[PDB]
Amino acid sequence: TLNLQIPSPTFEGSTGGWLRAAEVEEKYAITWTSPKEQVFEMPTGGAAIMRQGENLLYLARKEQCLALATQVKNSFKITDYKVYRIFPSGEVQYLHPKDGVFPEKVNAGRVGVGNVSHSIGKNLNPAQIKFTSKSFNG
């Protein structure tokens, strides 16, 4: 659940922020908690000061949010960040970390997607699967 009333870091603004596609197609939000007011680099260019307590920030791309998350993780030891997707209708979709546990750590209930049960050298030839809806993995 994204609290829209979380205060934002003090930023003077830039031309690198989100465009019309954020208000028309989709927008991303990142929240995190800091122990102090401190200066971080914006992923869109420029320096902003995050406040002590909670911080909510809006970006155009998921990669910008995760770059900011990596920056605050490796420079300020902040790991509680949450990344959401917001649609023009007002629907908020929680994205990261998806089950509360970071993806580099194994969590129960996760099911494997895209796993192939053989080595990469065992894929089928394109001539084998031509004019046929078989996948090249077999």
């Binding site: 465009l19 990469i120 894929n123 030839n125 394109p126 090249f136």
Partner: protein, 220 residues
Amino acid sequence: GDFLIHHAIALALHTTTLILVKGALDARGSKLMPDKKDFGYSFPCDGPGRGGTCDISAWDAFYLSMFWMLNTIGWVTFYWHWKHVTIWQGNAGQFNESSTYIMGWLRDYLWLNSSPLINGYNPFGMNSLSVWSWMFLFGHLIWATGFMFLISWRGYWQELIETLVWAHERTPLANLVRWKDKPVALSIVQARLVGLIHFTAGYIFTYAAFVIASTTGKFG
């Protein structure tokens, strides 16, 4: 001179065959990419990992061999035209004495026979060769334009287009007008193809204008 230019032709044929055969036989896979057949005949790369994999597909071998094909037909047609122009003039000894070194080719064939072509129009007037005089320069232009797609690559142009997208969205009286398709830079393979197309068109139009206007100016 004939000996040397046929051995140069043999070089160019063997090298173009090397590129094309190496592309065909490594099309299914190499040590750098053992699963290349899973990626098709044409794809940009496999990323900067494993040392970097620029131009690894067989389509890229076609793309590299196109320059060598242009080079070999250039050498063959240069030889044919210079030998025949010196023979038709009654001056075959000029070819016999000048074709054994490269400066003879540059001076007695390219520089010497360019004079009626580059004088198709001048500050004193114009004549019927002027169109070739235009087309020549036209070729020298578009060939060079091909270089832009073959030397500069995508990420620079994508960041420029991002700045342009911001400029159009923030400009009054123009943000009333909106694109239906998002502007992006040309893809990697597309840019290789477009640079090849401009390069090849410049090659063909430059040499066609030169050969027709030079033969017309000397003999017609």
